[PDB]
Paper text:
Targeted protein degradation is a pharmacological modality that is based on the induced proximity of an E3 ubiquitin ligase and a target protein to promote target ubiquitination and proteasomal degradation. Here, using orthogonal genetic screening, biophysical characterization and structural reconstitution, we investigate the mechanism of action of bifunctional degraders of BRD2 and BRD4, termed intramolecular bivalent glues (IBGs), and find that instead of connecting target and ligase in trans as PROTACs do, they simultaneously engage and connect two adjacent domains of the target protein in cis. This conformational change ‘glues’ BRD4 to the E3 ligases DCAF11 or DCAF16, leveraging intrinsic target–ligase affinities that do not translate to BRD4 degradation in the absence of compound. We thus introduce a new modality in targeted protein degradation, which works by bridging protein domains in cis to enhance surface complementarity with E3 ligases for productive ubiquitination and degradation.
To gain molecular insights into the mechanism underpinning IBG1-induced BRD4 degradation, we solved the structure of the ternary complex formed between BRD4Tandem, IBG1 and DCAF16–DDB1(ΔBPB)–DDA1 by cryo-electron microscopy at a resolution of approximately 3.77 Å. DCAF16 adopts a unique fold consisting of 8 helices, several loops and a structural zinc ion coordinated by residues C100 and C103 in the loop between α3 and α4 and C177 and C179 of α8. Consistent with its role as a CRL substrate receptor, this helical bundle of DCAF16 bridges DDB1 with BRD4. Both bromodomains are simultaneously bound to DCAF16 with a single continuous density representing one molecule of IBG1 located between DCAF16, BD1 and BD2. Although the JQ1 moiety of IBG1 binds canonically to the acetyllysine pocket of BD2, we found that the E7820 moiety unexpectedly binds to the equivalent pocket of BD1. Thus, both bromodomains are simultaneously engaged and bridged by the opposing ends of a single IBG1 molecule. At the ternary interface, DCAF16 encloses the hydrophobic dimethylthiophene and phenyl groups of the JQ1 moiety as well as the linker phenyl, shielding them from solvent. DCAF16 also contacts BD1 through residue W54, which binds into a hydrophobic pocket on BD1. The ternary complex is further stabilized by intramolecular contacts between the two bromodomains, including the sandwiching of M442 between W81 and P375 in the WPF shelves of BD1 and BD2, respectively. This series of interactions buries a large hydrophobic surface area upon complex formation, which is consistent with the highly entropically favourable interaction of IBG1-bound BRD4Tandem with DCAF16.
Residue numbers in the entry:
A (entry chain C): 60 to 166, 349 to 458
B (entry chain B): 45 to 164, 176 to 191, 197 to 216
C (entry chain A): 2 to 393, 709 to 743, 748 to 768, 784 to 1016, 1022 to 1111, 1124 to 1140
Amino acid sequence: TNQLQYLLRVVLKTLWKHQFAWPFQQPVDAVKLNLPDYYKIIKTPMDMGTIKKRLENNYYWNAQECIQDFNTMFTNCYIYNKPGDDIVLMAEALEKLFLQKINELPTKVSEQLKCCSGILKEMFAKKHAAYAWPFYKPVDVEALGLHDYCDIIKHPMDMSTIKSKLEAREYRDAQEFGADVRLMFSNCYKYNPPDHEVVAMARKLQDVFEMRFAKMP
Amino acid sequence: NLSPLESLAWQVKCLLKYSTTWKPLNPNSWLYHAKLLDPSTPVHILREIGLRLSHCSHCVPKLEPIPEWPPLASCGVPPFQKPLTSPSRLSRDHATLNGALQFATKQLSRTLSRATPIPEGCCCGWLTKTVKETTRTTYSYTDFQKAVNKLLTASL
Amino acid sequence: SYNYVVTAQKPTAVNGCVTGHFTSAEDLNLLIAKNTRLEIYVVTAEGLRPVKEVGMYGKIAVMELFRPKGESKDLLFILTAKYNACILEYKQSGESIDIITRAHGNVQDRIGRPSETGIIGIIDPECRMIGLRLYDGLFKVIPLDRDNKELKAFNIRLEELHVIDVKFLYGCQAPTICFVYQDPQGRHVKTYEVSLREKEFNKGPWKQENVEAEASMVIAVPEPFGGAIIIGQESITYHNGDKYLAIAPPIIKQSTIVCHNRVDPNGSRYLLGDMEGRLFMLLLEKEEQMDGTVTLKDLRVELLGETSIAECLTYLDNGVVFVGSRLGDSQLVKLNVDSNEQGSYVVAMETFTNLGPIVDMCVVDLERQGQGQLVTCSGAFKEGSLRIIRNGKLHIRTVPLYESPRKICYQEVSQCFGVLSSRIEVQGTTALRPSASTQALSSSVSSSEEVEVHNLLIIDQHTFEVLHAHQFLQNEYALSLVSCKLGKDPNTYFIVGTAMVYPEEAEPKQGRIVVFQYSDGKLQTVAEKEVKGAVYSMVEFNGKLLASINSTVRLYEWTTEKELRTECNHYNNIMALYLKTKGDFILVGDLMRSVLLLAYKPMEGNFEEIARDFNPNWMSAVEILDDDNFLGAENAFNLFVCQKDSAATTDEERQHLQEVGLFHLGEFVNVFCHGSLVMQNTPTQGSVLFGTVNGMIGLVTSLSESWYNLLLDMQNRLNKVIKSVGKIEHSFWRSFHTERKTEPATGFIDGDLIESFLDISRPKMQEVVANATADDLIKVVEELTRIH
Ligand SMILES: COC(=O)C[C@@H]1N=C(c2ccc(-c3ccc(C(=O)NCc4ccc(S(=O)(=O)Nc5ccc(C)c6c(C#N)c[nH]c56)cc4)cc3)cc2)c2c(sc(C)c2C)-n2c(C)nnc21
Ligand SMILES: [Zn+2]
């Protein structure tokens, strides 16, 4: 109907790009996220991606079914967490923005290297700049205080270094590039504990990178 | 569409959360109750850092702490408790202060008395680089507050 | 740094008085204690003849009289806000008078939280113990025996923490104490026996019982009536065992009651002070039975008239009553036997000069002869006035305004003061009494429960007649005022800052900056600029208008189109209240972040935050002594000098403003202003005059290193000779003291102490100077005293 179209093309598009959108763009992978009691406290997990899929394939029958889905997404975050948590602030900001917008609701190696250059250029876009920014440049061992990072990681890597290497044609074949990117992510995994939010961002960006690189010619 | 200053404050807060040397002011301090620092918008972390209300112990090891609650002489309200003295006597006591401190004390006493307690290396270099790269290589706390001061002056 | 602080006009507010046979068993004495002063009087049919005034090193907050057995005359108990306590005796020997200290000591506990309702002191009628209440949940007792000359105390736990008031009771086999305590269930009276043997409480004579929610005073009736009366906001009750009596006269329901005293030693008649000035009398009507016993049967309250707002009352003789004041004039009144032409039974006899509470002051020279004159707003509510002070001892004119003054500024081009003020009206609003705001030659209004309304007054310098009064918008509060010439415009304007108020808002979200001009004997608007906040102060800055709106410090420029335009801003403060200027620099004082220092850069157009002071203080007024020395005062009754550090190794050490001096003034400072009170055309340099809430007007100057070293040694030598009354060590009196930290005084010479050297006898002077001569030092003292 008209309201479903409005939600799909205005509200959904607006909330899909907001700088606080990325954490809610996928199901809550409790096992990876180390959430023991989460799956006992909420009986109806929900996420923006589920909403987009339902809207795109007309899973709904009534428009309010998607509104209650958004409200449930806010409600689960509110219930599980406590005031003062960053996710709580993100949920509050999203809720107020939705309320602002809802009021308007109407009544062949060369081919592989080319592909890898395209992928790396994609990873630099503003489309993912919300949560891919930690890796844009080499991790400074002095400007962030990580004394041991020099020792625990033996091969620092970052997207700028990979871009420079590609511009210099240092990669004889795409397999080296893939190994370098996977090393870049694995270093972050190995250094930090799983709780640190950086990992969440690394998992997101690596999911995107794999989705793109699996299509290498 | 989050504003640039809000986005920068958000990054500052998130990164600072994991620093074991960061010692933010107690969330129950009176400032958070008298509405002198807005708790909703993330920008207040910069305003704190501007005033040295929140500081890094590695750079500033001996900062005098900010009192949790004002002495009752300047607000007339004891911690999270309705005053014993009747309103009229309070009003007669506030008439002795000057014209400005009188208004400030009246405001504080009208606000705090309805408060409710809320149940509860060094990263400075990179923060200062992010701030300056937003407004425009070894730094310390001083060059962080000095940069946040200019950012606030030219942004708010 | 170095400085020199001296007292010019001794304080004149009254915060405690008592009557009894102090100086002799034959005489009757009225004892008035004012801050760090103790005044003694003798009552006579003519009036009061002062016999002795003695200053003490400590803010006297608890004063009482008692006559222990074996003494031919009373003794005086003094407890200061610094917890120095002593017991005094008035000893006379021919024409010489001395105050001899019987016992002295300190009763400050190591830990605790002082109570909200303030220190309380009370004495047993039989003189077996001295009661005190210095902390929540603890009662501090002091056994009264000749042996306890060092005042060794012992505590006793209190069941309930929130004690409103406590008193002793007359006529009990052992000391008994009654008080009012609050808890979630309400407010209750209660009783105990204070056993001096077990050092513990025991259940008292009668039971706890509920009282009116605002019950806030306790009176202990003497024999035979017994019991105590609980004075409330809307009713009065009398409790004694099974006896119980109450009265709720509508007459007192209009206003609260603040003080009381006993008239007849038999307890039949009491006086109750009122916040509106009324002076009620409370009658106890007795009843007797066949058993020969006496009991109470009814209570009556009647209105006698009007007097100054009272902080304490007392009865002397033949209906002569003394009314002390913290907000007005201290009056002696006669209580006649019949109503005097208006229903008032009250007539004044003599009036005393009281200056505080000063809320502003500016130094001018109306004679235009180079002679100083201070004009000071004073008083509150129906006792507001302006006290014009000029050097002779001082001559103190008066001008009643019958409304609250807030600010003043001198405007020479038309020779008239501009004064803000505020009266009180009761919700449509109605006036309570005539006042300058409606008694002026001409009036106009702005048109662009008790509720305040604020007026701006123009007062002529020659006659102090209220030339004109301007009323500000509804609910709007005027906060700051200044007179200056802006930019190139040859006119002279009044500028007033205002802040709107509403019940829901916690931080004011609207305000105005208004520009007025005075010519042709009339007052009219010229320019107004709306701003998003209150305006705590404004200053003339090299032709530009410098203001602070909430936390921001702002700078305005005066166009040729008669409007204010923004130049540059600032945002690094919690709440900026005070401002001062000298050349380019700006000294912003914040609510809690002490003093911030700026420097305006002409060739760039912005403020450079060159320094700060990080120690947390609660500032009240701030001023500049020179390019690099800053003075500031805080409600803790201290002064501290902030100095931009000269030697620094790092960038960080150039941000700290060091607190190079600390001094415990003993007064709440309220405003600073440059000026002096002697003719000019010497050790000290510069001058600054500051008001106080207790009326004490003081002077601050700078000293050169050599003079500071000399006067420091002179000060140390005096304390080994001057027999301070109460044996309170000088350094403890003048030590910086707050809730957080304590520090010995440094950098400030105690003016009042040095001048006292002029009084000691010649042998004492010789002993003082030993290891030079007195005259070579008497000259030094003389040069110093000439500054006031
Ligand atoms: C402390 O220095 C270190 O560690 C080493 C170093 N540090 C950084 C670094 C550190 C932290 C951050 C950062 C960035 C963003 C955020 C953030 O936005 N935080 C909100 C949040 C909270 C929870 C989740 S969630 O996904 O976990 N939770 C969750 C998800 C979904 C749902 C629905 C729910 C739900 C419900 N209903 C309840 N919870 C949920 C998701 C998001 C937090 C931290 C950024 C960078 C760093 C670099 S390079 C560099 C320049 C820097 C600054 N660097 C690399 C690379 N490697 N190491 C490091
Ligand atoms: Zn640091």
